[model samples]
Target: MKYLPQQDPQVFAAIEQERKRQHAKIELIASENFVSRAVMEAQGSVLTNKFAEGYPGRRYYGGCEYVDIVEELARERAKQLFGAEHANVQPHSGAQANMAVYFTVLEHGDTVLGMNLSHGGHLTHGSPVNFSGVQYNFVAYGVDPETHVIDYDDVREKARLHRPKLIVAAASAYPRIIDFAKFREIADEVGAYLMVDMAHIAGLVAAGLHPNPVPYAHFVTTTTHKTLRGPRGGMILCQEQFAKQIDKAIFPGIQGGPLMHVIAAKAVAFGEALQDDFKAYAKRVVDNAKRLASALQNEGFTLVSGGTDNHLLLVDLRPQQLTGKTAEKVLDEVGITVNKNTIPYDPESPFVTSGIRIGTAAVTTRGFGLEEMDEIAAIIGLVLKNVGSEQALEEARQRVAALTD
Candidate 1:
């Protein structure tokens, strides 16, 4: 808000409209969430003015004593929250954290075995467009054609053949519980370093709702936003032996000054994650996802990968006689927000994917439980049932707003 009105009213208005849009609509984007007001306040605090160049007590810039406390608190709380030996809460974003981990452990052109981008893997894992592929030699492992899940036997085969120096383990759109132990075993079999990008499931891992990879992964990375429900920031966690190299790679090798205010907000979020109730919240997130998925399936929607295991599910639009892009447009008009996602072995292009990805975290944050999930699913079913019907979408939009009020 500070940099909004004083500089640009148009941008401010857009922000206001987006805030309303979020409040009014059902947010189903898998990698998004609404943070607490306390977390937002910390992100907008005076610490934003500071330029902290290095880790605690080791500064390249002056006037960083206060920032040191902020960063140290974030580091300590994150370690406690995730049971990490060392945590660096300043990678700017998840992809940056991924980059930092790669930079720390591997050289350019080193063999890297990663999950396939088209099959639930993140771009930073190994897409040709990303630096991860250009700087390093990448081989891909993909989901099973039948189950639409990552095949561990196939992944192990690829790792053995590729003999990758670094093994990147993570997903972007995968909804199943990832096999951290299997990935670690595969990495160890070939003497490869394991870097787990827990960006999407960081909150579940923190709350012990999902398996934490810190014990198995040589390096772990994730964003503080999304399910963690904090400011847009990133973190890298690793064993103490790899701590110094990881920090140097993040600070001097890639980014210089750390965003102190965001780090403070991350500290607040980490503390929130440490609470006993956080586990219940994490459970509720998956419960809501399951409820929504069940409702959608009952309504004749074809859910990809059979269904979900965590907070999100993807629905293939082909059986509904719709495209993902078309469904997104109609759903947006009806105050339902979800993004088009590529299904495994998708025939459609990335921009116009064959599937729509949905999540429960944001609506869950807005106090919506399984009951709300039923209502929301019914509305979506109505819209899908009346394809291209403006009247139906309008009625659904009104119902959504009425529920919001």
Candidate 2:
């Protein structure tokens, strides 16, 4: 920080502003978290100067001994954390992690079965705008309109109908535990490979708070951030069988040199996730999410799927006759940051949907508990209920300051 402040005042000031903003505002976004200072130190290390273009001990470059050690630590810790037979701690982002898996397994025109985007699926899963959809024929399976839970029957039916080469399991916005066993069964029945994108729930799986997909899935992918609270990167886990293909796909196929510094940070994060306190941290994340969802319901806001079994929940804002666009803006104005999302069978466009997705992992990292969860829900309710009242909006801001302070 001292060097940056002296050398580059503009960038340093922006980083400082973001630091203060993070302290002042509530971060409810499900896909983000605050990493520890150890992780930051690792990410900022001189390892960034290395050019380890391949795996440990087999790199294209000669001066890779130390970077190899870091990569090995990251890979071994990731395998230990997820109980996987193989781990590839490369791929720059979750989307690339997924892209590598697809490249390793399937052909260009192959059919794939994935969850519907409107229901809970990520863009990488099958959005027509993404490369996955552009390359593969992706058929969608949707949730039940009444329950808001993923409809396994529909998944099986779609798998049967499409006869896909791969069946994608897991979601970005899903608020409940996924049935990996059932997904594996359906994939087996359809003679397709199962890939579970556990990016949103990697930390939960690491802490045994959610079911591990390693035993059931042929491949598993995750972002090192989110609930993992690590540096921004991605990792892939697979059986010992497909290890070489996965590695090749990432190194020469989709990406070039790996980020050794980020890999060091991932190793640091995996070390932290293995601790007992991380388990308690993840448990509190789920607990605080449930508390917040219940409090939101008490404040007359309906939650999608009734409630959550994990760290996130989606609030269906239609009951209040408010669009997700309006709610996200008003909540931001009040200093509670959230993102608009589509509910199951959303009537509105994705740009202006009927729900907002909120998660508790970041706040839980900030040491907020169930009481703070309840207060956040109340602030959201107050701001949304009185959008036209400047006094009420001001009151919500003060409450946010109080909670954050």
Candidate 3:
């Protein structure tokens, strides 16, 4: 950064501004977290110059000896953290990780079952615009409208009817516990492969706060960020029997020349996640989410599924007669950041949805506890209730400063 400050002042200034913003505001985005300086250092290491094109001891190019150590450390730590028989520390992003699995297991136009995008599923799950849906025949299962929870019976029914080659049990915005065991049962009954995308809750799973999917699924994929507090990258875990297939799928099949620097950061993050303090952090993340949800409920806001069981809360803004886009704007204005998300059976379009997703991971990482979460919920309620008022908005901004400062 010192060299960049002198050589590229504009980029340096932009980075500095973002640094200031992150320090000044509350980050409640469900899929985001603040990584440690150690992780950042690893990400900025000299390993970025390497072009490792294959797994350890089997590189397609020379000069990969050092990067081989970095990738191997990442893969070993990941497998140890998740209790997986094999690990692939590549794929670049969660989307690519998923695509690699699909490519490894299924053929063109093969039938697959996945959760519906509007009901907390990621775009790669089966959204028609994504390659997952375009290349394969994807049948969707969704949450029950009344309970806003996954209907296991419906999932079974869909599996029985479609007899898909694969059944994906994953989500991006879901706030409750995912029953991977149940998914496995269905996959077994249907003679299908079970793959889970635990991208949003990998840290919790690593801390034993959430049920580990590695024991039940044929393949599990996750991003290194979010609750994991790592650099943005992806990894996949599977049984040793599929080790060669998964590796081939990630390298020659989908992506090439993995990011060695990011893999190094992932290893650092995984090492940190193994510490006892990380377990306490994961516990606080869930505790803060519950406290914030209750505080919001007391403020007359409606939580999707009535509450949360993990690090995130999806607030249905319809009770306040507010749109998610407007809610996000006003929250950002008041120095509290969150993302607009679609709730189960959302009445509005995706771009103008009725819900805003919030999480306690980033704030909890900053040492905000139940008391701070209460104040945050109060500030959010204040801003939304007085959206058009400059005076109230300014007051809310001051309140946010009181907490953040």
Candidate 4:
């Protein structure tokens, strides 16, 4: 950052401070993680200067010979990682990847079936306020209120009734193993194309800890960052039958030029993911999550769906008489970061939800294990139980300081 400091001290200072914050805090955000230095360096490499507008061997711009290698390597690594017949590592984000699929398969106002946002679905999955809902017709299925879990029977019922042209099997905050095979069955019954957004658990899937969605879905999309520990970008994996259309949809259909540097970083991260160490790391992520969930429940906190089967836990804070918004702020004050999320059949609005979403991915990447997870849960219990008391807040801060230091 020497050049950056000299050219722009203000921005450089902010970046330095952010680096400090990441080092000093306990990150529990389900969709966030720290990429390795290799991934970071690749993202900051000279390939960022290139503007390759098309897939490898077919470019609209010159001076992309080197970036073409980068893009091809990214696509090949992605396909190998997910056992996909074809892969497109061009979409700038997961939302854009989903948008590209919509562009390729569905016409405007086509009926689509997706999970409900309030129940853990992403915005691109057809929230009425999002472009998806505005451009296409969407019917939502949510987790059952009693079980706080995806009700397959209800999903099938909704599909039978609405008969959507596409069925999106994905989630942003759901905490259990998603049965992609069952979703495939429902989609087949309705003759709908199945798209799975495995953005949240890509690493787990890569490590063979979670169910791979590639075999079941017609199109699978994911962000390279989250659990994959790559740069901030998106990728689409599909069957060979849709390879040409998927590439065209990502390029001329929605996006302009791909971020070549991010693609390079994604290739590096995928290489790392293919290692034995990464598989062990992913197994630890799930182990830490289960430990944290049990510890929180032991502290009298309510975990949605009873417990987690993956790296994240949706903690219902109603037991503590706290709103998700308030819990987020108070936890942040104690150097523990988490996001406010809505539980199934939540009474509160989206802004002020009834649950907090926590994950072990980032902390586990930071080398935290079961003991640390238990301590973190205890710290959360301490802070929430004494939200208005400065003494308790200070005590909690010191505990976090000890851990971070």
Which candidate, 1 or 4, has the higher lDDT? 4
lDDT of 2 by residue, 301-378 (tens): 999999999999999999889999999999999899999999999999999999999999999999999999989988
Ranking by TM-score: 2, 4, 3, 1
- Against the reference, the lDDT scores of all candidates come to 0.89, 0.94, 0.93, 0.93
How many clashes does each candidate structure show, in the order listed?
0, 0, 0, 0
Considering only N, C-alpha and C atoms within 3 Å, which residue pairs clash in candidate 1?
Answer: none
What TM-score does structure 3 among the candidates reach? Answer: 0.98
Q: Which ten residues in a row have the lowest lDDT in candidate 3?
A: 63-72
How do the predictions measure up, each by TM-score? 0.96, 0.99, 0.98, 0.99
- Candidate 2 ranges beyond 4 A from true positions: none
Error of 2 at 370 (Å): 0.6
lDDT of 1: 0.89
- Position 368, candidate 1: lDDT: 88
Model 1: per-residue Cα lDDT over 295-336, one tens digit each: 999898988788888898999888877778988988888878
**Model 4, 1-405: lDDT tens per residue?**
669999999999999999999999989999899999999999889887888898898999998888888888888888889899999999999989999999999999999999988999999999888899999999998898877889999889999999999999979999999999999999999999999999999999999999999999999999999989888889999999999999999989899988898889999999999899999999999999999999999889999999999999998988788999999999999899999999988889999999999999999999998899889999999998999998999999999988888
